Amino acid sequence: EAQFNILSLRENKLLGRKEVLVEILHRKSSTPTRQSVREWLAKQLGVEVDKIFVRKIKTEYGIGKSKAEVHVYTDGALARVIEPLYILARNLGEEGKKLLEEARKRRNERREKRR
């Protein structure tokens, strides 16, 4: 159904994060939710879900296997300053949506000014 495993885990001390690559095996089943991948990784690593960010879940052709690229951060402030706004919007839920909306408002401003 959904067999998850830590395929690999690199540690980038420069960005203060760990980049985990996870293997997901789901035969005859849909692609796993990125929320489910984050919950499994949080439970596996003993960390809060907010500290874990998914970059991309790519599913093979012709088989229910998916590889997920996940970032785990030592603190939420550096996580939100490093990860892209669309990534935070995908992962954090509503706070990423709020960040994207505020960015869009601040871009509409100064464009009206440039007009």
Binding site: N12, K13, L14, L15, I82
Partner: protein
Amino acid sequence: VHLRKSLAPYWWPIPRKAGGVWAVRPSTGPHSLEYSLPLAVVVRDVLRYAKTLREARYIISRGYIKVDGVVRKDYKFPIGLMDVVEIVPTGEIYRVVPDEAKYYDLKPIPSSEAALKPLRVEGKTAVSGGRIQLHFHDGRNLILPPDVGRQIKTFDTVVYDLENKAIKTHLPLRLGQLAVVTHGGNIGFVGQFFEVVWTLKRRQSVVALRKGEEVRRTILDYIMVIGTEAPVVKIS
């Protein structure tokens, strides 16, 4: 200024087709444009610490990377032959040494060795006060008194202390010393300087290095003496 990816140097460790149409252009610093790699390219494609130019520029702007004893916060800083690269939060120290396969590679070196740089003398000039300015292979200069400047010739090597701004040792270009090819085709070969044909132009003289029975030839401009039978600094 822009650098089209087609006009990027061929030895650079980047794909030639898959990617954008631009490449990070080195910012006119202490090397040659075609014999150096920008710091962002080193961070993103050589060490794989950053996944994008934004992340690489963040890492560089924090001051985590040190080149030749000085923190470099410019993402376009050129990195070239024999440069010491130091990562601060991790403690890892590399030397940019000539390589047979990648043509230029970051090889880890000891912390005691990290403060020394073997610089090939590229020329001498007479400057004010009667002093001698030595110009090295990466554009660095050193002003010395005339008596010490008299006995150092072009194509010699000096092991130079970055922290003291002094010449730790001088390795003159003599037959039988150990030399490394720092340029074209026969790059990275280490061997004994055992044969020379002195052309009229000294820079274009034909030099032959030997590694047991392995004989390679280059021009005199393309070799650097790294000492006698044992190299002074870890290059391999």
